[PDB]
Curated annotation (Swiss-Prot), chain C:
It comes from the Viruses. Glycans are attached at N15, N24. Coiled coil: none annotated. Major component of the virus occlusion bodies, which are large proteinaceous structures (polyhedra), that protect the virus from the outside environment for extended periods until they are ingested by insect larvae. The sequence of strain H is shown. The chain holds residues 63 to 123 of 248 of the full protein. Transmembrane segments: none annotated. It comes from Bombyx mori cytoplasmic polyhedrosis virus. It is found in: Host cytoplasm. This is Polyhedrin.
């Protein structure tokens, strides 16, 4: 045979490069996944991730309460935290023993897979009672926030999209939903409508609280070839298009 | 300038009246919200509210178990209440230490925003095992109950729609789902189908248990300009169309 | 005051007391503890030192 | 340049040796620290350390109770241990469920920094009710124990001073205070008296219970360049005077 890495007959090399290109392109086909992640960052350094993975379109929607830190199998000040929620829903509505609950998220990062169309991303960032914009009567039910998404890049390739916003102020108390649509550069929309209805049922969800960004990088992002951007603005993910 | 309240040049007056008219009309546009609330009333006077707010269409669906009273951070007879559920699912199926669980709802009120089309409202009031009408084989999956909805009115304006039913009997053990569609008096339905799929993801949900109808009025209904009807048949809400 | 003495203590409530012993071991020496959190919320976020107007500011240490 | 380690122009070598000499000499100046440690050794192998670090003079003073083992976040037989203290304070004064409390120290090691003047060391080893010598009326309030201190040495340099005494007998129940004065070979004492009063406020204290002598060596002594002597008579510390 020819010697490795010296000719156009390195079929092992060509096949490796096609395998990776096929994964990148398959994800982008209408047969492929589109995925979203919401990371909620807590003051003890822990991070809640919610992920949803589905064909065609995907999203996540959570209450104010559902985004607060929950420590499985430990104490959570559960009664005081009911009273904290009453004070957040309405000023002076509760009888809590703390000014600021450390279970409130300090920040949110929304990440989409590179198969999303960024122009289709929509976000409903509501107040603590789940109203998008002060009162229902004057609320558009979402904002199209794709312009704010930054490209997560590795080796020059877009591996995902990030929108990050801090919640550093006492008044930053939110409910949150986000949605994006898988790329579709074709003019095939229709015949497919019941398939999209089945995709709503077939979407797989995951949620877990990791103890630190380091652990999230090591045990969640990296093992699954997921894109991520850390607090130091470092990008994680795997470039695949035309690459060995 | 002209003197306030004496001429057609009170622009502050005209703008106030337009601001309110715009909120009422925006809510009714297809860009606006449609909202539903389910109130479950418990014998200790407390009320569980579930609210969902979304564009185009909205609904709520809950199990028998999910509608039972849950007191965050307090005792809930949790083991006995598992056994209560087994007896409700099948006669004599459980081993509970009580005849009637006080966590069962005594009544349900369904409220829609005034942006719903009442003729589109549908309800699936199932038995305790989540069957609409005795057995699945003979069940239509909903009833169209819009005729029973009463208009909640303030100053002559419809501020919302209410359907209220008591569950005063021992056999009143239900699962519940409800759905309505936002008004659409146009002939624009289609091109918009993936937007309606995103609305399913973008819908914001809220749930909380308030200790009394008074507290629900004061801290939930009123601060958010929501419509409500109390046990004394008193209407709450804010009239907006052509009003200062 | 010691490092430990400045950490938040909530009288008559839960304080994660065992985990917080392990947090102190990790603070005293990198990777010296076995705690279930990256950052203890009992750590001070800031300190303000105030003196009365009867102090001589040049003597403060 | 000259070649490393072959001439009087290895300025990196000279500076390293001066850096170390400066640290040893600075500690010995009146601007430097003097430090004391009391190690209380428990039968489960754990060790309580108390350290104080201050300018001019330093000491530690603890009750009988304060020297007993305390396991943070674990059970401590707290009620039985109150009764143990009553029996130790006065024969048959308590109602405890044990003959010997394993929280009693089995031994004490007192270590001073090499900046102390050993002739100034004083110790008040009291009985369990905090009397130096049987009855107050006949008690001198300390003993000058410097003659018993052994030199902890590394590479021929004194890195600290140790006095060690076992408490192996049932009657060895003590309260303890110790004090030493920083070296002062000058005839400058006076003008400085309010500075010494501020040093009483500025002294920094540390206390912690380590699970084993090994852990104390690895995580407390060694990382901080502290002197120590272990149960096998091995010396720990860092020699600095005229050394690279
Ligand atoms: N020294 C270099 N000169 C030219 N091209 C390079 C060099 N190093 C990497 N590249 C190539 O340039 C492109 C961009 O790679 P690069 O590592 O800059 O991107 P990234 O990892 O997204 O960004 P960054 O490395 O800045 O975080 C890739 O095709 C890569 O193979
Ligand atoms: N004494 C009155 N005479 C004529 N019109 C009135 C009088 N009081 C109020 N209105 C007007 O009549 C309309 C109906 O107001 P009204 O307060 O009756 O309605 P509501 O608050 O829905 O019902 P109710 O007050 O019976 O609960 C409104 O346009 C209002 O401004
Ligand atoms: N084989 C040797 N011959 C001559 N001098 C030595 C030798 N080994 C070490 N030294 C030097 O002798 C002095 C004493 O060092 P040494 O290691 O004996 O002291 P230490 O560590 O206090 O005691 P020990 O090693 O007995 O515990 C130092 O100046 C050192 O550099
Ligand atoms: N505003 C508050 C907060 C707490 N408590 C009381 O303090 C007790 C303990 O508080 P809780 O908030 O439930 O904390 P934990 O029991 O420590 O934690 P968890 O419930 O998550 O196990 C509760 O029984 C509650 O009645 C109260 O009266 N008022
Ligand atoms: N039909 C029942 C009801 C209760 N119990 C027992 O009584 C204990 C307490 O009852 P539970 O119903 O769990 O009430 P609480 O502990 O008071 O409340 P919660 O669990 O909500 O804190 C349980 O361990 C359970 O095994 C039982 O044997 N049979
Ligand atoms: N790193 C840790 C932290 C906690 N725990 C265990 O979890 C239990 C509860 O944790 P703790 O930190 O003591 O918290 P609380 O009991 O909630 O609070 P407190 O002790 O202040 O009342 C303890 O018995 C402890 O053994 C552990 O094994 N390892
Ligand atoms: N001489 C003693 C010792 C213990 N007890 C009783 O036994 C119970 C448990 O003993 P305690 O010594 O407090 O040990 P723990 O509860 O295991 O440990 P801790 O208190 O440190 O958590 C206490 O309520 C106490 O009243 C007693 O009557 N007489
Ligand atoms: Cl395709
Ligand atoms: Cl419209
Ligand atoms: Cl000096
Ligand atoms: Mg447990
Ligand atoms: Mg790079
Ligand atoms: Mg509790
Ligand atoms: Mg009226
Ligand atoms: Mg208590
Ligand atoms: Mg505990
Ligand atoms: Mg040696």
């Amino acid at each position: 045979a020819d010697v490795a890495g010296t000719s156009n007959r390195d079929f092992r090399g060509r096949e490796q490069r096609l395998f990776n290109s096929e994964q990148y392109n398959y994800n982008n086909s209408l047969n492929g996944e589109v995925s979203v992640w919401v990371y909620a960052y807590y003051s003890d350094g822990s991070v809640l991730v919610i992920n949803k993975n589905s064909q065609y379109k995907v999203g996540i929607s959570e209450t104010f309460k559902a985004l607060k830190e929950y420590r499985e199998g430990q104490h959570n000040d559960s009664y005081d935290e009911y009273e904290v929620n009453q004070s957040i829903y309405y000023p002076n509505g509760g009888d809590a023993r703390k000014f600021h609950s450390n279970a409130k998220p300090r920040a949110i990062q929304i990440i989409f897979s590179p198969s999303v169309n960024v122009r289709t991303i929509k976000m409903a960032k509501g107040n603590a009672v789940s109203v998008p914009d002060e009162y229902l009567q004057r609320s558009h039910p979402w904002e199209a926030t794709g312009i704010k998404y930054r490209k997560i890049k590795r080796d020059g390739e877009i591996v995902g999209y990030s929108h990050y916003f801090e919640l550093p102020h006492e008044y930053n108390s939110i409910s949150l939903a986000v949605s994006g649509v898988h790329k579709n550069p074709s003019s095939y929309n229709g015949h497919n409508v019941m398939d999209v209805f089945q995709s709503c049922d077939l979407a797989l969800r995951f949620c877990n609280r990791y103890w630190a960004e380091l652990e999230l990088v090591n045990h969640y992002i990296s093992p699954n070839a997921y894109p991520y951007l850390d607090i130091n603005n470092h990008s994680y993910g795997v470039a695949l298009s035309n690459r060995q």
